[PDB]
Each structure stands twice: as C-alpha cells, then as structure tokens.
C-alpha cells in the first residue's frame, strides 16, 4: 500500500536534508520543502491545498514564501480541520532567503509545531528512526556528511530519495 511510510528532515551547516522512503511524499513550494506522511488521499489533498495557498501568496506578495511563514501556514491550515483532521504527519524544511538560517519543523494531525533544531521524524517506525537519528546525528554536519548521516539513518530505519538543500541550489538523490 502507498499509504503511510516515513519522512525525515535533518539540519546541517547552511543546509538542510529531507528524505523519505517514497506516488511521492515530498513536495516543494519554492524554496520551502514539505514532506507529508499518512493517507495518500490526505497527502494529495494537502499538496493541492498548499499549492493553492502558496500560489495565491506568491501572487499577492510578489515574493516566495519563507519557510517559517510556510510553517505557520501549514500549522493554521491543519488546525482549520480541528474536527475530523487529515490523518497526516507533515514535515517542513527550508532555508530563509534573507538570513540563510536552515529551518526544519514537523507537525501533529492538528498542527502542533515541534520546530526542533536537530532533526524531525514522522510516521511509521518513528521510534526506531528517533533512536537512529539520536545516535548518528551530530551538530554542524557538512553537506556531504549530512547526506551520509541522513541517508544511512533512513536506510537503517527498516528505495529512498534525498534532497540536499543549499541556499542557492538543491541536490536530489536516490537510495536503494
């Protein structure tokens, strides 16, 4: 089944990583990347909704949404369906265009914000990957050391894709 699976995001120096075990579950709205686990119907509905919202944002502001503002947009859009939520675990990752601050966040079904600075995991096998990330993770990884850390952690969580995000470029990679 294509429902569920796992998404993880992780912070480096001047970079972030986001990865999932794969239909697709990582989306991007300009320079802000949203990973969503859960029901694939709800993943698709969230993708359509946040595409709508961020397109209207970009049209009204003449400006691409910043990851912190997109995080607040995701939070408020999830809470709107406080009763009968989407069965999803979204994760946002990105870098602020002005400050270059690498940013990650993750949410519950109703948009509580973790905003943890080190790493965020969601979905199936979350406690296994929490243990992996805690053990493997070290702060201030280089972009390629960050790639190795995220990709190895994901492979040991249980066919994967990795985005390495710089301020000015993004590298997309795949894993068996």
């Amino acid at each position: 089944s294509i429902n569920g699976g796992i998404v993880v995001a992780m912070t480096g120096k001047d970079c972030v990583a986001i990865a999932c075990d794969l239909f697709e579950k990582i989306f991007h709205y300009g320079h802000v990347f949203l990973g969503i686990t859960g029901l694939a119907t709800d993943v698709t509905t969230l993708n359509e909704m946040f595409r709508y919202k961020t397109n209207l944002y970009k049209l009204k502001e003449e400006r691409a949404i910043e990851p912190e503002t997109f995080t607040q947009l995701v939070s408020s859009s999830l809470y709107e369906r406080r009763f009968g939520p989407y069965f999803v675990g979204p994760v946002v990752a990105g870098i602020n265009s002005k400050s270059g601050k690498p940013f990650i966040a993750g949410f519950d079904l109703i948009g509580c914000i973790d905003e943890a600075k080190d790493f965020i995991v969601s979905g199936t096998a979350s406690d296994q990957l929490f243990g992996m990330c805690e053990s493997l993770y070290e702060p201030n990884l280089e972009p390629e050391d960050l790639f190795e850390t995220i990709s190895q952690a994901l492979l040991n969580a249980a066919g994967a894709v990795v985005y390495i995000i710089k301020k000015d470029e993004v590298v997309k990679r795949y894993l068996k």
């Binding site: 009204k60 502001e61 400006r63 503002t69 607040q72 947009l73 939070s75 408020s76 002005k98």
Partner: protein, 247 residues
C-alpha cells in the same frame, strides 16, 4: 424590498458622482501629510479643536494599525475611526492569524482599499468621506507610504499631502524632497510644511506626528526574547514636538 438601488452611479460624463463628492469632502478636510525618508516615514496633521476645553490628548488622528504600520486621514473622523477598527481587525484575522506575522504595508493597504471600495458598490451606504495616508515598514518591501482615496484607489508615494493645504503642501514637498533625507531631516521638513499649512496657533499641542523607524524595545513591554521586535511605529510626545519646534 429585497433589493436596494445603488446609491453611487455613473454620470453621463462617466464620473461616479458620490466618488467625486467624497473626494470633495476630502479636499475640505484639514491638512495632513507624510514623507518617506531613507530610514523612516513621517506622518503629521493638525489637531484642529472645536474648543480650547476639548482634551487634545483624545484627538487621536494618527493611529497604529500594526507595530510597523500607522495611518492618518483627512475628512470625516467617524469614518476614519470605523475604518481603523476594521483595518486592525482584518490585519489580525486575515494575516496574523494565518501566517503568524503582521501583514506587509502593501497588503494591509490593499485590504483597507477593498473595504473602502465596496462602500462604492453598495446600495445601502455612501462611500467613506476620507482619504488615508498609511505609512509602514516591511521586512522585504522596506519603508512604504500609501495614499488611499474614497474610491479605494491607492498609490505609493515618496511624499504627499491631503486636505485644504494639499496642493501647496505637495509643491513644498516636491521642491524640498530628495532621495537622501534622514528621518530627522524628514521630520524637520514635515514640521516646516505643516507650519506653512496650519492655520492659527502652531504649537506642539496643535500638531501630532508619528514616525516609522527602528524598533523601540522600550515600547515592547517585555524582555528576554532577543529575536522579538519592538514596535517601529512611535507617536512623538507634545514635549518632544515642542523640542523640535524650538529648532
């Protein structure tokens, strides 16, 4: 009774009469003006009072819309007050409650313009008899100054003035404005323009002036969140205004 005919309509000339008459009501209002500096914006106006027994400290013609955005008006004060209330409410509801941050000045101006425009379509209400100068700062658009007219049209300005003195003030600004003003220079030019525009007693209690500037952490009211930003809108006290006038 299910319908009410539109109160605002085009004349055979193609001009919407009630819009022209609202702009005339604006022309009748007391002078107000605003000036972009490189490092701030000034907005100023006369506190005309119907009596010396009135409390000038209650004639709040300049009002905060957001910590980074302020408004002034000429014309029907009650309409301005209702528009300020609605603009604050929409700044919270439409934007702060969605994105967790205050709107940029451009979008709050657009929201005020939308509110003012719809009074021009309704068959139940007249248009608002006010034009607003809205000055503000945005993290990306920087300092900005907009003039909103009774039609709900708005344009960005480097400096402008509205009301009785509007034309003479706009000429004084056009000769005296330059792209290098500091906020203290803009404040001085604003005070000189209003001195030239005001009628009768010109003192720190017959004027009020607000600025958009750097953050004021002493106006934030709390300490210990170092990323958190003091308000950039600041009304000058009549003491400070008098200390400017002694220049």
């Amino acid at each position: 009774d299910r319908y009410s005919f539109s109160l605002t309509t085009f004349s055979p000339s193609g001009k919407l009469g009630q819009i022209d008459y609202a702009l005339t009501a604006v022309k009748q209002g007391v002078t107000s003006l605003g000036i972009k500096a490189t490092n701030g914006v000034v907005i100023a106006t006369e506190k005309k009072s119907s009596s010396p027994l009135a409390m000038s400290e209650t004639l709040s013609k300049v009002s905060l819309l957001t910590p980074d955005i302020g408004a002034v008006y000429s014309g029907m004060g009650p309409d301005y007050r209702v528009l300020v209330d609605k603009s604050r409410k929409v700044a919270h509801t439409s934007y702060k409650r969605i994105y967790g941050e205050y709107p940029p000045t451009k979008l709050l101006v657009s929201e005020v313009a939308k509110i003012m425009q719809e009074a021009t379509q309704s068959g139940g209400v007249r248009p608002f008899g006010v034009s607003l100068l809205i000055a503000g700062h945005d993290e990306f658009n920087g300092f900005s100054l907009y003039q909103v007219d009774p039609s709900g049209s708005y344009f960005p300005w480097k400096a402008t003035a509205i009301g009785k003195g509007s034309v003479a003030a706009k000429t004084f600004l056009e000769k005296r404005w330059n792209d290098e003003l500091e906020l203290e220079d803009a404040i001085h030019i604003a005070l000189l323009t209003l001195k030239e525009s005001v009628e009768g007693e010109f003192n720190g209690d017959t004027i009020e002036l607000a600025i958009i500037g750097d953050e004021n952490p002493d106006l934030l009211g709390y300490t210990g969140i170092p990323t958190d930003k003091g308000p950039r809108f600041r009304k000058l006290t009549s003491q400070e205004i008098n200390d400017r006038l002694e220049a």
